[PDB]
């Protein structure tokens, strides 16, 4: 914590003042509400990124370097946003990514409420479950209200492989439909908001408890290699997706060892700062795949900074099989539990359908590159420092004013 | 007053208050009863406002915001039940439409309205915007000023103009300049026009679209007026208010899913004398303007979600989402009026328009109220015109643009690129809202003067002389998104400071 | 005015608190002091630009799109910043440009104090005199303390040519050394700060007193043409410079009709808004001249937004014969009269010498293009609108804080 | 204590107070009298501070800011007059040097100093900066944090790093990583070093440069220390304070106009054991740091200007402005120590350095304290290294960079481009100012950890594996200057807002 007596007071009062879920307009509304009501600990843990949080923000910003070239006078009365992911039919082209410790924001239900929100309405959304979920995989998969809802397991390979061996067999038996092996966290990203929180709140055996090593964990084997993945292919039938690819070279390697897909991701900017926006790695990757007809050998997903239907649409047009979101659902789930998640799903689903009509296409398969203006995709810029004295003494024009009372 | 049959079984203040449910909605408007149940899902203004005022007397909401002809033209006769007997409980008759408007806002605003500066003191189009932002009801200001979703395109429409600079000619005789031109076969005094916008009555209750008509045709400088199919005034009263016979009026058309209504409407406006039809194609689905939505919510713990309708709520029979190129070809065969396709957002579709032979297109994204991340039309114009020429198609299609135009230099830049004319929406709504018809006229003078003055400094003397070589287009594509700012580095950094006066 | 009783009160008190001239560090200091002490009328008149004042600011900003490629290990003990302009030797590579109505900020002396500041110290700076100066040309030229100081006359050709005829003969007889004919003001730029001032302070014969025409004046003939300049060449011996060129095409025409030079200028951004930064037109112009050895046929000057020695140095390296400044001197002259002007001259002179040593060259002639990095000269950018909701709800990292008292 | 001849005609508190003029300046330092008249124009600290305290006892200003050896090494014996007799009027003996420091600032700051957070709670290098900004005297903070003129380059040094992104490798065994490397013939624990900075005593009065020496060599991780010719400590005490024999100390050299002093100094530091000589060439003239100047003015109508000296005031015999390439060639012949040219700002000069055969260069602009608009060294490095290879010259010259480095990822980016090592100045001055030697050590741990942690995520395990293919350099040249913001448009515009809580 580090949560005062009056901190708890103010927050329970704010949660009682949460607006009606019917009044939430977009995914940022959940984020705002969450920012005022979660404990300092849960907020820092969910909202933080690595170091200067540049990548975390760039993930979102890069989407804005892409504009649309919509078609008009196309019959868009009826549209469809369902598609297939990893051999299963899905109602939407997005999914809930794995996020550890959902109980920080939703103590009673944690990941269970996410499972429920994902399957309780007419729209069924796939849920990725973190190896580090605060609920057990059994209880999470059991809370899923529908048999038609997909659940994927995000796997962290343990240094003690036998634990992973047992884990993989357990989740497979439980029904998950795929394994997403996270490879962008061999060392823990440094999330300074958390750390600052812990210091303001106020070690006997050496060896691998000092400096950089403090960011290593036996839980997440830092020596995981391509060979290990090849091995994993032989020990399971579940489709395998490598989560955390950050360069085209590694997408090519994934195809070469024949896994089912990759997730171009930088862990929501929580790992290596200055890793590129996945939307940008995607734009570079897909064309290169086609130039080797790896076209369909590999399904390419992306996550990071997706907050609008139009963000999703851009990824789809570039060729992403699906688009993942982490924080928005966390916030929705933390403020309004399962219903919050359901509402988040509706908001994103309606955003995609609506803008799909304005783009002039009627199905996910019709989302193609020609629908995008990619001409300014590389305009990732850093301005020359502002001329302080010049702009400080300068006085800009002013608007006309009303007469004196 | 609607053409209701006053010879029908009168109805009672009790049998009405009954039907106040989404599937059995009855309402009273000026002593008459209507079954609006089948209607609401298509209400252009949203079903919610009708839903949450069902079974009640709604005249105070309805009357000041609608064209005199909507019940006639859009409600099925069978649905016009009959005369109401008496009144309605005082708590069952709705008050004026002013979502979130407090008694204190009304107070403060009527006072500010008395303090509006003299129209002679208005310098530029932003002044009207400022004044309007402080005096309109929250609802009117939201409805006029909102854009779709994050309002990026709305802003980008304007910003993109700043990616273009001028290459002016000096030592050219510019004593005399002329800014008149021709558009769609008619001579026009200026190269700009007032674009279609619905609900002009929100900011100008007494006159709405009619004062726009007056402002555009009363002075020495006349400007073309485009009339929205969804105007708050009828096309006959708008056209009749036109002070001059030489002023141009265009009709913006929304094709109905019921093509008979559109066929009748086209014949009607053509008989009324509009000079062209601008068919809007960028709104098959309603853009989400969150400022409005928020305002409507502020009124109206852990969960409630049940029968929330989807993306279908943004569809309406008033704007047929199935409109296609074939429909436009058919439209050409039913009218002698020049046809312009309004809402083109890519060169491919400007080519298709040339191919089916319509008169022109408006490169537009509806003022950024529809698809967010649609490009600035000025940028689409830059790409389009050269491509037309690489096929002579230039002069085969008149290309207009709108969106974010606030300065005469913005107009000049579009003209140099080859636009036939430039449209403006919001600025005129603000001018009309604050100062009525004379506001519209003042706006016209401001923009006219801005175009002539800067035309002299550009070194040309007529619209036909505005060409691309007058522009520096080298940085037109420098539409950028910076790397996120380094928060810690910039927070702790202290910049240079100016010298200061000696202590008193 | 529009100057209250308490406005005058506050200002006379502020002027009495002006810091010692020895304490002025750079040209912005004069601007700040001037902004607090001049009358609203004088401040609006001097500080305003046309319309949205984009060009006025861009004039300065474009200099920052150029960096230096300085040479080290060069003997820079002794340096020299003198050069020649229009056939005369000058101590510095800059000059005071014409500015109308100097008496608004300096009521007692106006342009006379500029003449004095320009010639009273060891550094003699050329002064350009506005046809619309608030002092007569005779009194201004007479106030010049030195015979070695240069004075140029900025000419506005009158609709009544005979007046210009007489004017040209008069200034020539008085000793001015050149004629700078202003061609960027056939119509008056709209300076909204002025106008706003006049409206808050609260027409009988038609014809050419309405709308756009109100910006025309018989004083400044709007029908001036190249032919007229050709004529002017035949009626005077003084070198002729066309002031207000804004495109290379017109620099080429100047060479063709054989005038002495041009001033790439947009009137300090007071005329046509969105006219380019002269520094940028210069970078494009000089190479094109050489590709026609017009190399030395025409002397090319520039003004607009020059506030630092390094700004001057950039212009010189690109090939400008001299660099003009308007507002800074106005401010200096308005706050500290002639001494203010002298101090401004020292500040700019020392800035140029000092940075010249760091650039690794020792004379104006050694300032060349290879000293500049022009690779980002065209990075004049306009960002995509800021994502308001995303950045508003986002919370950036924070610095560590001191312990509680 | 200086080596003064205590056998000279004593002098009196009256014959001293006399010489208080710029051309007859006498001062007393620790009971001795000196004729500093010929000296002041060359005083590295500016002539003004000596001028305006002439004829007085200045020990309180002098003593805490200078190396123990400056009167010995830089004042002519003849100018060391003799012993003073008695004292000096209490109003003729200067107080500590604290320009603009009010009694209340001293109060507030000594209190904040007691409230400094535990060193274990410092997370990154910006924390030291923040803490230092609140606790140093105005003079010390200005002197450390200022840049030249508009401080653009100072900021650009840092900003340019953000124009580079990473292309990390995944699924690589990164259990073990090593960040040691070699620099100028010596093995180093890390790929970074503490760069030369004068006046470390400003922020650390008791230890200055000696605590830097300690911080750099006391822990398990040792870092190279570059010593300024203008350090506030003597080279012998700085080198003697070094806790470890394995720690590296480099000497930053400023060639004197009097080459005999330089010849002696080079021989002295070489005998003391420094491992290299970094000759600084980017300061022939003193950069103008306006924050300092302003501070000095705040103390000290229409005019006074008379004998104001010019650009010459920025020259000093301590830094020979006539240093040339030939001088460096000669220097090679007088020492066995590796020579590095510090302050190279363009590729042409890196080539010239290879040609004369020195050991390396530091691409640097002196932390943005010299020429404003000098480019970010990280950008010069990107251009330089490939060009070296297109001539094999790589490996012939070790290329270091400094300026604006605050994160391990900044270091990693320079290493991938081919830098042999990366220097930091300010961060260490702030760490040393707030927490002394342990602060320096903590800074070293912070940066070390940052390099190792991100190295693992980059997918490599040693310094030698840091290569260009690990970097995305596609936007390295996107150094931009936006069009001026449209003030009126953006002022009147109202952005989207977040939903809000229900009223209490
Ligand atoms: C008789 C049938 C009706 C027709 C044809 C009609 C048509 C329209 C149209 C064209 C608009 C403008 C849409 C736009 O902004 O583009 C509008 C707005 C509106 N209408 Fe109606 N309307 C009808 C009945 C009603 C009724 C019965 C109510 C009862 C409360 C109502 C309340 C409103 C309101 C409040 C708005 C403003 C909505 C907003 O933008 O916040 N209308 N209507
Ligand atoms: C005995 C001869 C002296 C030598 C060799 C000497 C040398 C230096 C050096 C190398 C610096 C650091 C310059 C830098 O920042 O790079 C300095 C700063 C300074 N010196 Fe001296 N100094 C001498 C005498 C004096 C005297 C007599 C005073 C008397 C008041 C004085 C006052 C200062 C002050 C105040 C500073 C700090 C200036 C600032 O940055 O604001 N020095 N000196
Ligand atoms: C609080 C939090 C916890 C996370 N935990 C995991 C995890 O345990 N395993 C994993 O593979 N990714 C994890 N992620 C990363 C997400 O799966 C995903 O890559 C990221 O959230 C996408 O970016 P976004 O938050 O902007 O949508 C986490 C992200 C957050 C914000
Ligand atoms: C409040 C408002 C209502 C509008 N209503 C309509 C309409 O009914 N039909 C139509 O074709 N366009 C409509 N438009 C779009 C305009 O015709 C035009 O595309 C746009 O306003 C140009 O952008 P601007 O407001 O930045 O000048 C509307 C725009 C606004 C701002
Ligand atoms: C208050 C003011 C008055 C001016 N008057 C004239 C004038 O009468 N004639 C002329 O040719 N230029 C005139 N100029 C423009 C200057 O000669 C010069 O082009 C401009 O000041 C350069 O830009 P700067 O102010 O940023 O240095 C004036 C500028 C200002 C600011
Ligand atoms: C307060 C201060 C004093 C400095 N003194 C010297 C010096 O005496 N000699 C030298 O070669 N460089 C000197 N430098 C420059 C540094 O060696 C180095 O180039 C610079 O600090 C790197 O930039 P950074 O501060 O952003 O890390 C100084 C820098 C600062 C900030």
PDB file of C-alpha atoms in Angstrom, chain C residues 81-207:
ATOM      1  CA  UNK C  81      33.817  40.411 -38.960  1.00  0.00           C
ATOM      2  CA  UNK C  82      34.029  43.443 -41.246  1.00  0.00           C
ATOM      3  CA  UNK C  83      32.962  43.127 -44.889  1.00  0.00           C
ATOM      4  CA  UNK C  84      31.633  45.166 -47.812  1.00  0.00           C
ATOM      5  CA  UNK C  85      28.066  45.984 -48.719  1.00  0.00           C
ATOM      6  CA  UNK C  86      26.957  47.832 -51.829  1.00  0.00           C
ATOM      7  CA  UNK C  87      30.485  49.149 -52.504  1.00  0.00           C
ATOM      8  CA  UNK C  88      31.187  50.371 -48.962  1.00  0.00           C
ATOM      9  CA  UNK C  89      33.326  48.857 -46.207  1.00  0.00           C
ATOM     10  CA  UNK C  90      31.350  47.986 -43.095  1.00  0.00           C
ATOM     11  CA  UNK C  91      32.596  47.070 -39.606  1.00  0.00           C
ATOM     12  CA  UNK C  92      29.962  44.327 -39.216  1.00  0.00           C
ATOM     13  CA  UNK C  93      27.929  41.993 -41.421  1.00  0.00           C
ATOM     14  CA  UNK C  94      24.541  43.229 -40.174  1.00  0.00           C
ATOM     15  CA  UNK C  95      22.547  46.492 -40.339  1.00  0.00           C
ATOM     16  CA  UNK C  96      19.509  48.296 -38.958  1.00  0.00           C
ATOM     17  CA  UNK C  97      16.516  47.870 -41.287  1.00  0.00           C
ATOM     18  CA  UNK C  98      13.926  50.530 -41.971  1.00  0.00           C
ATOM     19  CA  UNK C  99      11.131  50.831 -39.450  1.00  0.00           C
ATOM     20  CA  UNK C 100       8.447  53.488 -39.663  1.00  0.00           C
ATOM     21  CA  UNK C 101       7.450  55.629 -36.723  1.00  0.00           C
ATOM     22  CA  UNK C 102      10.415  55.282 -34.361  1.00  0.00           C
ATOM     23  CA  UNK C 103       8.908  58.187 -32.361  1.00  0.00           C
ATOM     24  CA  UNK C 104       6.206  55.897 -30.939  1.00  0.00           C
ATOM     25  CA  UNK C 105       8.767  54.273 -28.661  1.00  0.00           C
ATOM     26  CA  UNK C 106      11.290  57.129 -28.565  1.00  0.00           C
ATOM     27  CA  UNK C 107       9.124  60.338 -28.767  1.00  0.00           C
ATOM     28  CA  UNK C 108      11.964  62.820 -28.339  1.00  0.00           C
ATOM     29  CA  UNK C 109      14.490  61.442 -30.806  1.00  0.00           C
ATOM     30  CA  UNK C 110      12.920  58.640 -32.874  1.00  0.00           C
ATOM     31  CA  UNK C 111      15.095  57.742 -35.857  1.00  0.00           C
ATOM     32  CA  UNK C 112      17.717  60.285 -34.785  1.00  0.00           C
ATOM     33  CA  UNK C 113      18.687  58.159 -31.801  1.00  0.00           C
ATOM     34  CA  UNK C 114      19.083  55.167 -34.119  1.00  0.00           C
ATOM     35  CA  UNK C 115      21.442  57.186 -36.329  1.00  0.00           C
ATOM     36  CA  UNK C 116      23.441  58.112 -33.191  1.00  0.00           C
ATOM     37  CA  UNK C 117      23.600  54.629 -31.710  1.00  0.00           C
ATOM     38  CA  UNK C 118      24.772  53.394 -35.110  1.00  0.00           C
ATOM     39  CA  UNK C 119      27.702  55.736 -35.317  1.00  0.00           C
ATOM     40  CA  UNK C 120      28.572  56.786 -31.774  1.00  0.00           C
ATOM     41  CA  UNK C 121      30.730  53.802 -30.739  1.00  0.00           C
ATOM     42  CA  UNK C 122      33.742  52.089 -32.239  1.00  0.00           C
ATOM     43  CA  UNK C 123      31.400  49.914 -34.244  1.00  0.00           C
ATOM     44  CA  UNK C 124      29.687  51.699 -37.130  1.00  0.00           C
ATOM     45  CA  UNK C 125      26.511  50.101 -38.378  1.00  0.00           C
ATOM     46  CA  UNK C 126      24.608  50.944 -41.530  1.00  0.00           C
ATOM     47  CA  UNK C 127      21.120  52.394 -40.951  1.00  0.00           C
ATOM     48  CA  UNK C 128      18.242  51.975 -43.448  1.00  0.00           C
ATOM     49  CA  UNK C 129      15.783  54.889 -43.242  1.00  0.00           C
ATOM     50  CA  UNK C 130      12.054  54.378 -43.854  1.00  0.00           C
ATOM     51  CA  UNK C 131      10.254  56.629 -46.326  1.00  0.00           C
ATOM     52  CA  UNK C 132       7.725  56.713 -43.471  1.00  0.00           C
ATOM     53  CA  UNK C 133      10.204  57.578 -40.745  1.00  0.00           C
ATOM     54  CA  UNK C 134       8.762  59.861 -38.097  1.00  0.00           C
ATOM     55  CA  UNK C 135      11.792  62.192 -38.468  1.00  0.00           C
ATOM     56  CA  UNK C 136      12.764  63.900 -41.719  1.00  0.00           C
ATOM     57  CA  UNK C 137      15.576  62.401 -43.750  1.00  0.00           C
ATOM     58  CA  UNK C 138      17.593  65.626 -43.273  1.00  0.00           C
ATOM     59  CA  UNK C 139      17.422  65.618 -39.497  1.00  0.00           C
ATOM     60  CA  UNK C 140      18.181  61.868 -39.329  1.00  0.00           C
ATOM     61  CA  UNK C 141      21.211  62.082 -41.647  1.00  0.00           C
ATOM     62  CA  UNK C 142      22.358  65.148 -39.802  1.00  0.00           C
ATOM     63  CA  UNK C 143      22.243  63.457 -36.402  1.00  0.00           C
ATOM     64  CA  UNK C 144      24.727  60.824 -37.629  1.00  0.00           C
ATOM     65  CA  UNK C 145      27.817  61.349 -35.339  1.00  0.00           C
ATOM     66  CA  UNK C 146      30.317  59.997 -37.876  1.00  0.00           C
ATOM     67  CA  UNK C 147      31.152  60.571 -41.521  1.00  0.00           C
ATOM     68  CA  UNK C 148      32.199  56.988 -41.863  1.00  0.00           C
ATOM     69  CA  UNK C 149      28.726  55.702 -41.047  1.00  0.00           C
ATOM     70  CA  UNK C 150      26.562  54.504 -43.889  1.00  0.00           C
ATOM     71  CA  UNK C 151      22.952  55.441 -44.370  1.00  0.00           C
ATOM     72  CA  UNK C 152      20.632  53.832 -46.876  1.00  0.00           C
ATOM     73  CA  UNK C 153      17.227  55.078 -47.915  1.00  0.00           C
ATOM     74  CA  UNK C 154      14.238  52.762 -48.061  1.00  0.00           C
ATOM     75  CA  UNK C 155      11.951  54.102 -50.759  1.00  0.00           C
ATOM     76  CA  UNK C 156       8.199  53.650 -51.247  1.00  0.00           C
ATOM     77  CA  UNK C 157       7.358  54.699 -54.804  1.00  0.00           C
ATOM     78  CA  UNK C 158       4.360  57.126 -54.680  1.00  0.00           C
ATOM     79  CA  UNK C 159       1.415  56.916 -57.108  1.00  0.00           C
ATOM     80  CA  UNK C 160       2.363  60.511 -57.867  1.00  0.00           C
ATOM     81  CA  UNK C 161       5.749  59.683 -59.332  1.00  0.00           C
ATOM     82  CA  UNK C 162       6.920  63.302 -59.245  1.00  0.00           C
ATOM     83  CA  UNK C 163       6.985  63.060 -55.433  1.00  0.00           C
ATOM     84  CA  UNK C 164       9.277  60.029 -55.677  1.00  0.00           C
ATOM     85  CA  UNK C 165      11.367  61.835 -58.332  1.00  0.00           C
ATOM     86  CA  UNK C 166      11.892  64.689 -55.911  1.00  0.00           C
ATOM     87  CA  UNK C 167      12.452  62.286 -52.999  1.00  0.00           C
ATOM     88  CA  UNK C 168      15.096  60.292 -54.761  1.00  0.00           C
ATOM     89  CA  UNK C 169      16.972  63.450 -55.730  1.00  0.00           C
ATOM     90  CA  UNK C 170      16.752  64.810 -52.193  1.00  0.00           C
ATOM     91  CA  UNK C 171      18.071  61.722 -50.365  1.00  0.00           C
ATOM     92  CA  UNK C 172      20.786  61.326 -52.997  1.00  0.00           C
ATOM     93  CA  UNK C 173      21.909  64.890 -52.432  1.00  0.00           C
ATOM     94  CA  UNK C 174      21.835  64.266 -48.669  1.00  0.00           C
ATOM     95  CA  UNK C 175      24.406  61.497 -48.975  1.00  0.00           C
ATOM     96  CA  UNK C 176      22.527  58.180 -48.581  1.00  0.00           C
ATOM     97  CA  UNK C 177      24.555  55.423 -50.239  1.00  0.00           C
ATOM     98  CA  UNK C 178      21.828  53.301 -51.761  1.00  0.00           C
ATOM     99  CA  UNK C 179      18.113  53.015 -52.464  1.00  0.00           C
ATOM    100  CA  UNK C 180      16.185  50.017 -51.133  1.00  0.00           C
ATOM    101  CA  UNK C 181      12.835  49.971 -52.963  1.00  0.00           C
ATOM    102  CA  UNK C 182      10.211  48.101 -50.958  1.00  0.00           C
ATOM    103  CA  UNK C 183       8.045  45.870 -53.079  1.00  0.00           C
ATOM    104  CA  UNK C 184       6.294  43.656 -50.513  1.00  0.00           C
ATOM    105  CA  UNK C 185       3.695  46.176 -49.481  1.00  0.00           C
ATOM    106  CA  UNK C 186       1.506  47.152 -52.488  1.00  0.00           C
ATOM    107  CA  UNK C 187      -1.387  46.528 -50.077  1.00  0.00           C
ATOM    108  CA  UNK C 188      -1.191  46.922 -46.296  1.00  0.00           C
ATOM    109  CA  UNK C 189      -0.772  43.738 -44.285  1.00  0.00           C
ATOM    110  CA  UNK C 190      -3.533  43.256 -41.708  1.00  0.00           C
ATOM    111  CA  UNK C 191      -1.999  43.504 -38.195  1.00  0.00           C
ATOM    112  CA  UNK C 192      -4.817  42.427 -35.951  1.00  0.00           C
ATOM    113  CA  UNK C 193      -3.193  43.426 -32.621  1.00  0.00           C
ATOM    114  CA  UNK C 194      -3.371  47.057 -33.771  1.00  0.00           C
ATOM    115  CA  UNK C 195      -6.911  46.771 -34.985  1.00  0.00           C
ATOM    116  CA  UNK C 196      -8.113  45.135 -31.796  1.00  0.00           C
ATOM    117  CA  UNK C 197      -6.558  48.036 -29.873  1.00  0.00           C
ATOM    118  CA  UNK C 198      -8.372  50.621 -31.996  1.00  0.00           C
ATOM    119  CA  UNK C 199     -11.826  48.980 -31.749  1.00  0.00           C
ATOM    120  CA  UNK C 200     -11.871  48.930 -27.959  1.00  0.00           C
ATOM    121  CA  UNK C 201     -11.491  52.734 -28.194  1.00  0.00           C
ATOM    122  CA  UNK C 202     -14.669  53.391 -30.278  1.00  0.00           C
ATOM    123  CA  UNK C 203     -16.956  57.631 -44.351  1.00  0.00           C
ATOM    124  CA  UNK C 204     -18.780  60.269 -46.475  1.00  0.00           C
ATOM    125  CA  UNK C 205     -17.568  60.037 -50.253  1.00  0.00           C
ATOM    126  CA  UNK C 206     -17.323  56.625 -51.834  1.00  0.00           C
ATOM    127  CA  UNK C 207     -15.173  55.203 -54.315  1.00  0.00           C
TER     128      UNK C 207
END
